[PDB]
């Protein structure tokens, strides 16, 4: 019964910024930690930002920190994520993702690429 | 950072087969005030996401059937498939959730051998 539909990716030039939106249904999003991981074709899947339950608090994959921004809104069952300042490397199919509160992976969205490229 | 390495990269097995695969983490996962591993396994079918497999490194995930297993414990673990099935070809990673950042292994593909 869990959903979790991303949306927002596309193409976007070296430097620029693009905004993914993550839809939740059919379980408590208030109450469960999000996740953005992200996965390049041929590769594992990359951690990229973490929001606490509730009222919030985030964590950044080093590579990640100051360009990117996680975002909530409980009453919306909401997740963001912001990106700015993209490289090629940033190129990849992004995941909204529900944990469990130890950390692991409960529930996956379909994806949405995400295209870097000058 | 703790790093996850799987192997084999790749392994055929036929209908029926037992399937093994491993995953090493360069740091011990086990946490002493649980004596748990914060180890988790994924599948990944073709054009799929991941779907989470096991958790704790042998508990079995709702909706997973009896002849997927994990075992191991601190840094060194195994997934098992009894018994293959077709709808078993996947990607599988094993993924360290024990601390920030939660770290993936690359990966092992599980091909259908005739």
């Known amino acids: 019964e869990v959903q979790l539909v991303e949306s927002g990716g596309g193409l976007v030039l070296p430097g620029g910024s693009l905004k993914l939106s993550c839809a939740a249904s059919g379980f408590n999003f208030g109450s469960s930690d999000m996740n953005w991981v992200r996965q390049a074709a041929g590769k594992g899947p990359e951690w990229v930002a973490s929001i606490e339950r509730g009222a919030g608090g985030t964590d950044y994959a080093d590579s990640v920190q100051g360009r990117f921004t996680v975002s909530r809104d409980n009453a919306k069952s909401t997740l963001w994520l912001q990106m700015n300042s993209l490289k090629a490397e940033d190129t990849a199919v992004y995941y909204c993702?529900?944990?469990?509160?130890?950390?692991?992976?409960?529930?996956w969205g379909q994806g949405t690429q995400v295209t870097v490229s000058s | 950072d703790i790093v996850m390495t799987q192997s084999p990269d790749s392994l055929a097995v036929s209908l029926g087969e037992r399937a093994t695969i491993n995953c090493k983490s360069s740091?011990?996962?086990?946490?002493?005030?649980?004596?748990?591993?914060?180890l988790a396994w994924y599948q990944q079918k073709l054009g799929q996401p991941p779907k989470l497999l096991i958790y704790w490194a042998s508990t079995r995930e709702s909706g997973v059937p009896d002849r997927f297993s994990g075992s191991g414990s601190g840094t060194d673990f195994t997934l098992t498939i009894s018994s293959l099935q077709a709808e078993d070809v996947a990607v599988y990673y094993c993924?360290?959730?024990?601390?920030?950042?939660?770290?993936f292994g690359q990966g092992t593909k599980l091909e259908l051998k005739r």
């Open positions: 740091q011990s996962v086990l946490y002493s005030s649980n004596n748990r591993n914060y």
């Open positions: 993924h360290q959730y024990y601390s920030h950042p939660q770290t």
């Open positions: 993702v529900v944990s469990d509160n130890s950390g692991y992976y409960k529930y």
